[PDB]
Enzyme design. Structure first.
Site, PDB file in Angstrom:
ATOM      1  N   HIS B  44       0.784  -1.226   0.000  1.00 27.93           N
ATOM      2  CA  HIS B  44       0.000   0.000   0.000  1.00 27.93           C
ATOM      3  C   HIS B  44       0.823   1.287   0.000  1.00 27.93           C
ATOM      4  O   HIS B  44       0.285   2.351  -0.329  1.00 27.93           O
ATOM      5  CB  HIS B  44      -1.007  -0.015   1.142  1.00 27.93           C
ATOM      6  CG  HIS B  44      -0.480   0.320   2.488  1.00 27.93           C
ATOM      7  ND1 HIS B  44      -0.271  -0.631   3.485  1.00 27.93           N
ATOM      8  CD2 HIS B  44      -0.239   1.515   3.041  1.00 27.93           C
ATOM      9  CE1 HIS B  44       0.126   0.000   4.586  1.00 27.93           C
ATOM     10  NE2 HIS B  44       0.158   1.314   4.341  1.00 27.93           N
ATOM     11  N   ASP B  93      -0.633  -7.591   1.543  1.00 24.61           N
ATOM     12  CA  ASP B  93      -0.087  -6.240   1.621  1.00 24.61           C
ATOM     13  C   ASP B  93       1.419  -6.359   1.890  1.00 24.61           C
ATOM     14  O   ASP B  93       1.880  -6.221   3.019  1.00 24.61           O
ATOM     15  CB  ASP B  93      -0.840  -5.425   2.665  1.00 24.61           C
ATOM     16  CG  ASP B  93      -0.459  -3.946   2.682  1.00 24.61           C
ATOM     17  OD1 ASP B  93       0.248  -3.552   1.724  1.00 24.61           O
ATOM     18  OD2 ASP B  93      -0.870  -3.234   3.648  1.00 24.61           O
ATOM     19  N   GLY B 186       1.455   6.839   8.770  1.00 28.24           N
ATOM     20  CA  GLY B 186       2.877   7.080   8.593  1.00 28.24           C
ATOM     21  C   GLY B 186       3.776   5.964   9.143  1.00 28.24           C
ATOM     22  O   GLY B 186       4.987   5.974   8.882  1.00 28.24           O
ATOM     23  N   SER B 188       2.950   2.866   8.338  1.00 30.96           N
ATOM     24  CA  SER B 188       2.722   1.875   7.271  1.00 30.96           C
ATOM     25  C   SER B 188       4.028   1.243   6.770  1.00 30.96           C
ATOM     26  O   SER B 188       4.969   1.978   6.506  1.00 30.96           O
ATOM     27  CB  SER B 188       1.985   2.535   6.119  1.00 30.96           C
ATOM     28  OG  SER B 188       0.682   2.957   6.470  1.00 30.96           O
ATOM     29  N   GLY B 189       4.020  -0.075   6.589  1.00 31.77           N
ATOM     30  CA  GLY B 189       5.184  -0.750   5.992  1.00 31.77           C
ATOM     31  C   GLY B 189       6.268  -1.081   6.996  1.00 31.77           C
ATOM     32  O   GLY B 189       7.150  -1.892   6.679  1.00 31.77           O
TER      33      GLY B 189
END
Lengths: 10, 237
Positions: B44, B93, B186, B188-189
């Site tokens: 994403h 994801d 923020g 994310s990942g």
């Protein structure tokens, strides 16, 4: 945007 | 990160910041160094900006405000997104990033150990999530890398809080029933790492969740052990 997105611009 | 604290140098040497430079430069997502030329993050993060030219990857950095025009960064050679990734449901994801040049390893820039394909059943008791994301809903990016200790939750408990979406065995959830500690926008990942036997292991990739640190609303992570065949296939020389 996905409903529970973490993407900053979402 | 909500409810976390400031990290010190060398605690999380795999943590990277994925930034976009268009007219201005901004942190968008976290990621984990897994090899000299490989960064694992969330699919994403590339929804919207799937081309490699705008990305700059910072490693060996603790404080985003310490970044200046002379700070070194990595560029992307290739973005590999899972073939079955679906934006609306957050399935698969996960993404790999091949860097244009291999990084030297240092105490502040080194890979996280990945789990074994069999770790799908492993119980981890001491897990942490890191990043530069918001410290509350409707907050702001944080300068110093934040860390928070969060318990993993069963798929059964997580599914109850998300009746509008399926929680699969390829996902892992984490959070407190009373809320207060969680990843946020923020983050994310970025990584969900668990410590066992003095060693840290990548267990999850920060993916999605309703709000941030709300009561009875755990965060959802990509379960890395469930993608180890994919990771090793895609990173094969």
């Amino acid at each position: 945007c996905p409903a529970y997105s973490x993407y900053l611009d979402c | 990160i909500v409810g976390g604290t400031n990290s010190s140098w060398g605690e999380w040497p795999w943590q990277v910041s994925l930034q976009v430079k268009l007219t201005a430069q901004r942190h968008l997502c976290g990621g984990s160094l897994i090899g000299h030329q490989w960064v694992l993050t969330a699919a994403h993060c590339f929804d919207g900006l799937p081309l490699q030219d705008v990305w700059r990857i910072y490693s060996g950095i603790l404080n985003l405000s310490d970044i200046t025009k002379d700070t070194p960064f990595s560029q992307i050679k290739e973005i590999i997104i899972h073939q079955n990734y679906k934006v609306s449901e957050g399935n698969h994801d996960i993404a790999l990033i091949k860097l244009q040049a291999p990084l030297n390893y240092t105490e502040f820039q080194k890979p996280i150990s990945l789990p074994s394909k069999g770790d799908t059943s492993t119980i981890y008791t001491n897990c942490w999530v890191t990043g530069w994301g918001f410290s509350k809903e409707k907050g702001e990016i944080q300068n110093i890398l934040q860390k928070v200790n969060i318990p993993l939750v069963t798929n059964e408990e997580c599914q109850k809080r998300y009746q509008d979406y399926k929680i699969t065995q390829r996902m892992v959830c984490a959070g407190y029933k009373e809320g207060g500690k969680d990843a946020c926008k923020g983050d994310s990942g970025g990584p969900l790492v668990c410590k066992h036997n003095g060693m840290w292991r990548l267990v999850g990739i920060t993916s999605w969740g309703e709000g941030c640190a709300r009561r009875e609303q755990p965060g959802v992570y990509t379960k890395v052990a469930e993608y180890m065949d994919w990771i090793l296939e895609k990173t094969q020389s």
